[PDB]
Ligand binder design. Structure first.
Ligand SMILES: *SCCNC(=O)c1ccccc1Sc1ccccc1C#N
Ligand SMILES: *SCCNC(=O)c1ccccc1Sc1ccccc1C#N
Ligand SMILES: [Mg+2]
Ligand SMILES: [Mg+2]
Lengths: 236, 5, 236, 5
């Protein structure tokens, strides 16, 4: 790998510089190099990995949705035949997106998840595995689409089981996992009732635990609780 | 789209 | 080149799709492929070329300025030594920026400018040559920095001479050229008085010609006149 | 920064 000759600490330093410069592709390449050094990631370093790939794949998903919408309109009655170009370019963006997801899933499988023993790291990585299978599911249409969906579900479910056993209901990693698994139910699994039930139960059980928190922990937890409420407002 | 983190 | 097998019309079609998807690196690669087909560009196609590289190099300049600022702060008294990483990463971004500028200048030299006979295309391309030498000048510090600055000046000057002879004072290409040459004077050539004089004279001579214009031409010209006024307000 | 087009 092109980052093999750079110090782990220098890769982390440059990931933070890339974030400041809004150079998220660079940030992801630096964090990929850091993971491939083979040492476990700290809490801060896990955040940097999350931020880098969230921004990269988020831009790809946004672009894929624009192109897919144009493609759908071109396949409407009375639409003028414009040739293969829209499908080709949507496929190009889709293929790059799948490549990014496969890269992230590869880092989690080699070997972030198997070395993560603490609940905070293990739930973080398993949620991430669910997320990037979810992005693969968003563009999937083939023989393995159901298996891609079930790979997302299985990763999310394992993260949920651990988070319920090992973390308080206000833990931001637990809350963020529930937020995203709820979105998986709504948008991927055709299960809006499960999506709404999960978001509501997660919100209510966090509300009841806020009294235990410091001001700074309260801020983190209520921030994600508001995202749960926002989704519930969208869905009801 | 709905919020995710 | 990787676009050699794709039809010119398909490259233009996908450049417009990439613009809709805000995929400006793709847009630039498609327009580079279109230019390399060897045919002259239409007015619309020149716009697409401008848009693609403006967005790509604009992001690189923004990132370079963030990193350069961090680097300057690290070289202040009482700043803790953090190692070579900031300089290395600034150099990396700087090198990619220079690569983009060299690519654009290469397209103009092979062979867009020499085949451009109409004032509208020739002024557009020569202004573009001035612009991308200006971006090279922004990061230049070596033996050829004065020569880079003079390459920008010379391209701008040739475009100005043609635009004054062949275009009305409200022509948007002429106005945009004067806007950017004025910025060259202010930010690159250490000539704020020339910058202000050019922006003011350009604004006043366009104002006096607006009465000749249709509503739609008036909108284009006054839009750029307001950019001249904005710069004048910044500078006075 | 100043405006350019
Ligand atoms: S990609 C970076 C943004 N997301 C997260 O930080 C993240 C990742 C996994 C689970 C939850 C969250 S959100 C979070 C986590 C810790 C502290 C605060 C917040 C928030 N908001
Ligand atoms: S990169 C696309 C934006 N810039 C320009 O369109 C451009 C390029 C060269 C000279 C002037 C201009 S601005 C312009 C040109 C034609 C019509 C309207 C406008 C504007 N505004
Ligand atoms: Mg495909
Ligand atoms: Mg250099």
């Amino acid at each position: 790998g092109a980052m093999g000759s750079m110090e782990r600490a220098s890769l982390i330093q440059k990931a933070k510089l890339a974030e400041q410069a809004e150079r998220y592709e660079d940030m992801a390449a630096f964090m990929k190099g850091a993971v491939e050094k083979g040492e476990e990631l700290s809490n801060e370093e896990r955040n940097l990995l999350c931020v880098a790939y969230k921004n990269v794949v988020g831009g790809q998903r946004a672009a894929w949705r624009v192109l897919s919408s144009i493609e759908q309109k071109s396949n409407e009655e009375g639409s003028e035949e414009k040739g293969p170009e829209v499908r080709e370019y949507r496929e190009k963006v889709e293929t790059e997106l799948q490549g990014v997801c496969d890269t992230v899933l590869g880092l989690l499988d080699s070997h972030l998840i198997k070395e993560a023993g603490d609940a905070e790291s293990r739930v973080f990585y398993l949620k991430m595995k669910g997320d990037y299978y979810r992005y693969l599911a968003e563009v999937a249409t083939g023989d393995d689409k159901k298996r891609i969906i079930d790979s997302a579900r299985s990763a999310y479910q394992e993260a949920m089981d651990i988070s319920k056993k090992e973390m308080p209901p206000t833990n931001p990693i637990r809350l963020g996992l529930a937020l995203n698994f709820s979105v998986f139910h709504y948008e991927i699994a055709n299960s809006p009732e499960e999506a709404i039930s999960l978001a509501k139960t997660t919100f209510d059980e966090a509300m009841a635990d806020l009294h235990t928190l410091s001001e700074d922990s309260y801020k983190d937890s209520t921030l994600i609780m508001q995202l749960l409420r926002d989704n519930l407002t969208l869905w009801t | 789209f709905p919020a995710t983190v």
